[PDB]
Paper text:
Glutathione transferases (GSTs) are a superfamily of proteins found in all cellular organisms, which usually exist as multiple isoforms. One general function of this superfamily is the involvement in detoxication reactions for both endogenous and xenobiotic compounds. In insects, the Delta and Epsilon class GSTs make major contributions to detoxication of insecticides, contributing to insecticide resistance. We report a new Epsilon class protein crystal structure from [name] for the glutathione transferase DmGSTE6.
Numbering used by the authors:
A (entry chain C): 3 to 222
B (entry chain A): 2 to 222
Amino acid sequence: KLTLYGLDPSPPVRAVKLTLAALNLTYEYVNVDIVARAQLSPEYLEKNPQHTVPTLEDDGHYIWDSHAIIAYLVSKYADSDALYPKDPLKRAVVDQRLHFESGVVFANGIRSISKSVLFQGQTKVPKERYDAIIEIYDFVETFLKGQDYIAGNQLTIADFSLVSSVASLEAFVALDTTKYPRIGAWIKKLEQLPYYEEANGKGVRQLVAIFKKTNFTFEA
Amino acid sequence: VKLTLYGLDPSPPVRAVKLTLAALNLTYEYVNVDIVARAQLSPEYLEKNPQHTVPTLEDDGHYIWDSHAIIAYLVSKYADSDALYPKDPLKRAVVDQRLHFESGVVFANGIRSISKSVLFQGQTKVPKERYDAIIEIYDFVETFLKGQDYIAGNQLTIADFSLVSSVASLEAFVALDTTKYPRIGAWIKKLEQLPYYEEANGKGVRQLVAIFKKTNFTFEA
Ligand SMILES: N[C@@H](CCC(=O)N[C@@H](CS)C(=O)NCC(=O)O)C(=O)O
Ligand SMILES: N[C@@H](CCC(=O)N[C@@H](CS)C(=O)NCC(=O)O)C(=O)O
């Protein structure tokens, strides 16, 4: 019995939706209205004291942080270790990419802007935040050099994690696929998964539209 | 020997790896990478780590980077038991949440946000936002320690090494009020009892604090 707490525009929530779909697991999806600060309710804080989404409930146990969740799901429920290989050297690449996503991409790239634009209602965003997004594209383009997937030669949860956030960066800076052909090819490859549209595609488009509506701009 | 660690003592994620190597009693070569001299940007270093960060670990022709990936690798490959990184999916999920909390909320948003501005871009005035972020980190860690002696449960794990390397470093920006944060104070004190703590984490924390003291940076009101 799985319950996922979150909302479709959220990148880390979509990373979990991709993993759940890839593992063909059934779950209840509970909406959490972040703009209304519904995550700050006493009832949600009891589930996740960091008051973030996603939170996964698995038969009474609460797990949070999307990367911890999707590793947990694969380790516990997958038929094989395909999505999260147990071989320590292969796992070390996956883990590096996941922690890259946690810090460099999401915390420094996305939440840094979401906080000032959506949470604080500010229209102007410091130029450093633009520079941070270009740095992310540059790194991811390098990470994809000579391989079809982000962490090696097979689909893993690192792909789910990073595609959920890297595709979201379009909300701030459109991806130039002439400058970034590897990133373009990799998103296109992942878009072919039958569950991609419902798990990640539509939420990306929603987030992009949310930020379009704010009319935010980068400071020079 | 077979293991090489690339890094430098003031760096919190390098110290996370030094703590783990010490706890596992592994021998290794320590190679200094002077990030102040931008030595991590040499083409030679980029071949080992294209993200040009420290730490990097070299193990028999393989390069691993990101401190959290490195220390999970070390325990899984070399430890006698999974004590420091339990394999039980549920216990593992708590450790993993704490590690990723360190990557994003603590290091990226808390420390590197200020370090880049102050150490490498020479800014002396830091926005109040960055002070508030450190206080929120202290608030979260205090909550995480509720009812237990360690950060991810009832036993020492790599989550303790990761988070103490960075949380102890926060003194460089905001001194820790142990009357407001008695659990954090006790937890740091408990880890300081580890005989390998002084060399692995303690010296470098003090170095980092002294580096920031010298810059004379302040937070805006
Ligand atoms: N790295 C974390 C990010 C979690 C996170 O910050 N989620 C955002 C939504 S995208 C959130 O919960 N914001 C509300 C809050 O922190 O109060 C993860 O992968 O779960
Ligand atoms: N979260 C990463 C942080 C790595 C990191 O950013 N290290 C800093 C030093 S504390 C660095 O290498 N700065 C040089 C650079 O990024 O070029 C980890 O745990 O390894």
